[PDB]
């Protein structure tokens, strides 16, 4: 029987490194014409070409792993490896081996899971995600947290190549030298941002973001656009 | 002026390391209340919290960056400073340093890259995403590529929880053990899969994949489901 036995795989944490084990059996690894190729598949998505390792040490790897993965076999074990190093969370995925030019009698594949902890983080919610206005128009943008944030909730604008920069801070309070056309406020269980009358330099991108818990998040945005 | 003054970024590669500087300009690190945050923007995407040092060496750090990058501070520069190590492609970001409870005063962003390679990756689009079939139905899947592959095409089986299956390598070659209900081919610049008559055991997500040229690429799945 041909087949691949893989090995190895869990729960790291980011930054951490670990190797995925698949032992060959029935065939060498040496066999000229053989190679050994990892793919990965993120929970939910498609598969991803990672490397391939050849019989005479030829080998390639994809952008996304280069620098952090190396792909190794050992004749002696007839065994390949996947050295992963310098995890993130987005290395999260189930891992397969696979031998050989197409891929065939693939490893049963194993979950790697790259978390630092849960997830308890506060979903910021902004309505809506763009907008059209006129000069002179008034402007409501809305939010709302997932949890209950008390007035901690601030307002941003940033402009296409500039740094965001603060507008209202704990719900209501305009910050010094913003033009008291924005106002901020919170109904039932949601925030507002106003702008009375839309002025030229208003067009923007705005961010809605709670500080009553770490982590700090932000809403997706609303772009203000010319109509 | 009250302001902050980045430095550092550029484009590094997978795995490598870099340090951002932000120097406080009009006031102190050390005051008491002050703290620094590190903020990152994907290009087209929103804001996101990296970390927060504040005066009394108190700090949090994001998930996204646990493990990966620490925050600093050095009062003998008055600078704050971002050490990001192992970057990969998904670190790529315009990052903000923003003064303390809300972030106002931010610095002007610099861009980060991490990147090993252009982009001459070739795209593989099927069609459909999904379909509704009964047994005994005929099913035909499609697939192109965004460049010629010639007939280096082949099409995989993955059923859900279990490892991809090899069903037909180099367009239209049948794996041995397949049941010949199964066939491929190959029209005007696209790739066709067809079921002849799908049987219950067919329900699955099937993947075309070309391998003409490193890196091998996947198209992104289509389910046979029941109707």
């Known amino acids: 029987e041909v087949q691949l036995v893989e090995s190895g795989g869990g729960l790291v944490q980011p930054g951490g490194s670990l190797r995925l084990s698949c032992a060959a059996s029935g065939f060498s690894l040496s066999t000229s014409g053989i190679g050994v190729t990892w793919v990965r598949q993120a929970p939910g998505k498609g598969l991803e070409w990672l490397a391939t390792i050849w019989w005479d040490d030829d080998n390639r790897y994809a952008d996304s792993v280069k620098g952090r993965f190396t792909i190794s076999a050992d004749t002696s074990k007839n065994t390949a490896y996947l050295q992963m190093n310098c995890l993130t969370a987005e290395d999260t995925a189930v891992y397969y081996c696979?031998?050989?030019?197409?891929?065939?009698?693939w490893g049963q594949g194993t979950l790697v899971t790259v978390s630092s902890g849960g997830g308890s983080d506060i979903q910021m919610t902004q309505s809506p995600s763009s907008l059209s206005a006129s000069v002179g128009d008034r402007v409501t943008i809305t939010c709302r947290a997932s949890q209950d944030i008390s007035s901690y909730l601030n307002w941003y604008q940033q402009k296409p190549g500039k740094a965001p920069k603060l507008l209202i801070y704990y719900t209501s309070s305009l910050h010094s030298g913003v033009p008291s056309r924005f106002s901020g406020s919170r109904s039932g269980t949601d925030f507002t941002l106003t702008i009375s009358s839309l002025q030229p330099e208003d067009f923007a991108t705005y961010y809605c973001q709670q500080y009553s818990k770490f982590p700090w998040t932000f809403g997706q945005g609303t772009k203000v656009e010319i109509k | 002026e009250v302001q902050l003054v980045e430095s550092g970024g550029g484009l590094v590669q997978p795995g490598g390391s870099l340090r951002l500087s932000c120097a406080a300009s009009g006031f102190s690190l050390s005051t008491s209340g002050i703290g620094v945050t590190w903020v990152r923007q994907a290009p087209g995407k929103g804001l996101e919290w990296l970390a927060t040092i504040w005066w009394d060496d108190d700090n949090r750090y994001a998930d996204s960056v646990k493990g990966r990058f620490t925050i600093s501070a050095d009062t003998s520069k008055n600078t704050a400073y971002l050490q990001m190590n192992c970057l990969t492609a998904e670190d790529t970001a315009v990052?903000?340093?923003?003064?303390?409870?809300?972030?106002?005063?931010?610095?002007?962003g610099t861009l980060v890259t991490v990147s090993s390679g252009g982009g001459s990756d070739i795209q593989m689009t099927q069609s459909p995403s999904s379909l509704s079939a009964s047994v005994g139905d005929r099913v035909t899947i499609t697939c192109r590529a965004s460049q010629d592959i010639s007939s280096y095409l082949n099409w995989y089986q993955q059923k859900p929880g279990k490892a991809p299956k090899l069903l037909i390598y180099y367009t239209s070659s049948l794996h041995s053990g397949v049941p010949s209900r199964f066939s491929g081919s190959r029209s005007g610049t696209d790739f066709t899969l067809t079921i002849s008559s799908l049987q219950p055991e067919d329900f699955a997500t099937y993947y075309c994949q070309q391998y003409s040229k490193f890196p091998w690429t996947f198209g992104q799945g289509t389910k046979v489901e029941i109707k």
């Open positions: 696979a031998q050989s030019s197409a891929m065939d009698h």
